[PDB]
Design a protein around this ligand. Structure first.
Ligand SMILES: OC[C@H]1O[C@H](OC[C@H]2O[C@H](O[C@H]3[C@H](O)[C@@H](O)[C@H](O)O[C@@H]3CO)[C@H](O)[C@@H](O)[C@@H]2O)[C@H](O)[C@@H](O)[C@@H]1O
Ligand SMILES: [Cl-]
Ligand SMILES: [Cl-]
Ligand SMILES: [Mg+2]
Ligand SMILES: [Mg+2]
Ligand SMILES: [Mg+2]
Ligand SMILES: [Mg+2]
Ligand SMILES: [Mg+2]
Length: 377
């Protein structure tokens, strides 16, 4: 007796949500679900009933502008990982602490680091269950693959956004989140906090010895076919790899940013936030679909399919490839993505892509500072 509009952001999970929506429809014939500029689509009169969104700055801006249903105090929230809930709350782009409310439910977590080929690790005598603990050991590992005739790093520089992954992996350890508050008030600068992360990202891609200029898809295809030791993307890329080669033996590791082995941090965020249009007129029916998606069976099936981390208090890891980072989650040694502090209007991806190709660190830093200053004032 209603048809819901479902906006589903994630290309890599398109099939999973299509099948879940169909399953719900068969069990609830009165509720049909139709799946598909963002400011245009989210206009109040036509806002989607059910929404998935990546948990980043854009989520936070739409949350602050009232596009999304306010889930604060919803009975469902008590079943969820408090850290992941607080991540969602802290994304709200507001200077008012009381406005840091919950505008979606964490549905799946990710981590940023690198995906590595365990068979190639074994090939050159490395322990596939215990990846490098320091920057020097990480670089030594890459040099080891190069010297053994193996392409150490599969870059994907044709798609600018992928260059943001190593930056966030490295910054997670090098740059406390508190620095971005200081950055906003002018009490620090990009030169002071991001010079070292960009320098190390440039050093990383020194070891992209083959096919560095390919697309996201080409890169994960190459890696699936065994042509590189690591691909420095987050957990979200794992299903893109395994779909090409289903029994590839993968690990996922934290990328250690310094030679301080006792102070390493894992960048991790809410990969998928599930929410409702605030001005939607079918909230009762939408919530039924959302409660279905947020059930343990669906969450863990999604996690298995997408190599993700469930949002329930008792965390489930969807792929044994994630075991090397389990310690970071258990100990709460995690950090926000640094680009969750960067306004969407700033084309950081383009700037980073350029900096990696030219090696011009100072132009990246000054461009970011220029763009930032104009936004903040
Ligand atoms: O470090 C990269 C990214 O990690 C998280 O986002 C995970 C997200 O990454 C991809 O989405 C990208 C889209 O494909 C692009 O079209 C868009 O321009 O850029 C985003 C990344 O910003 C995967 O496709 C997607 O499945 C996955 O969920 C962080 O939340 C994000 O801030 C980081 O940029
Ligand atoms: Cl918890
Ligand atoms: Cl588990
Ligand atoms: Mg985004
Ligand atoms: Mg911190
Ligand atoms: Mg095939
Ligand atoms: Mg195979
Ligand atoms: Mg130390």
């Amino acid at each position: 007796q209603v048809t819901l509009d479902f906006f589903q952001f994630k290309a890599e999970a398109a099939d999973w949500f299509k099948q879940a929506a169909q399953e719900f429809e068969k069990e609830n014939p009165d509720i049909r679900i139709n799946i598909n500029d963002l400011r245009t689509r989210f206009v109040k009169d036509r806002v989607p009933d059910v929404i998935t969104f990546n948990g980043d700055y854009s989520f936070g801006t739409f949350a602050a502008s009232g596009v999304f249903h306010d889930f604060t105090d919803d009975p469902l929230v008590s079943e969820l990982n408090e850290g992941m809930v607080n991540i969602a709350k802290n994304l709200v782009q507001t200077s008012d602490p009381a406005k840091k409310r919950l505008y979606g439910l964490p549905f799946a977590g990710n981590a940023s680091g690198y995906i590595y080929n365990k068979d190639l690790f074994r090939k050159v005598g490395l322990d596939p269950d215990n990846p490098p603990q320091t920057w020097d050991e990480f670089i030594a590992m890459l040099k080891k693959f190069r010297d053994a005739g193996i392409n150490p790093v599969q870059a994907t520089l044709a798609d600018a956004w992928t260059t943001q992954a190593p930056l966030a992996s490295l910054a997670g350890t090098l740059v406390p989140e508190s620095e971005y508050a200081a950055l906003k008030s002018g009490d620090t600068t990009f030169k002071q906090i991001w010079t070292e992360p960009i320098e190390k990202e440039i050093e990383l891609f020194k070891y992209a010895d083959s096919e560095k200029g390919v697309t996201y898809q080409q890169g994960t295809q190459n890696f699936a076919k065994g042509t590189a030791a690591i691909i420095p993307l987050g957990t979200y890329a794992i299903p893109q790899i395994t779909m090409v080669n289903k029994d590839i033996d993968l690990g996922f590791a934290q990328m250690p940013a310094t030679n301080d082995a006792s102070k390493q941090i894992l960048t991790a965020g809410d990969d998928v936030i599930l929410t409702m249009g605030a001005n939607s007129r079918h909230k009762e029916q939408s919530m039924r679909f959302i409660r279905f998606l947020m059930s343990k069976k669906q969450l863990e099936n999604y996690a298995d399919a997408q190599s993700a981390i469930t949002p329930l208090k008792e965390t489930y890891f969807g792929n044994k490839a994630l075991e090397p980072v389990r310690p970071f989650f258990e100990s709460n040694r995690v950090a926000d993505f640094c680009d969750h502090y960067i306004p969407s209007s700033i084309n950081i991806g383009g700037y980073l892509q350029s900096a990696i190709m030219s090696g011009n660190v100072n132009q990246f830093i000054d461009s970011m500072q220029n763009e930032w200053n104009k936004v903040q004032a």
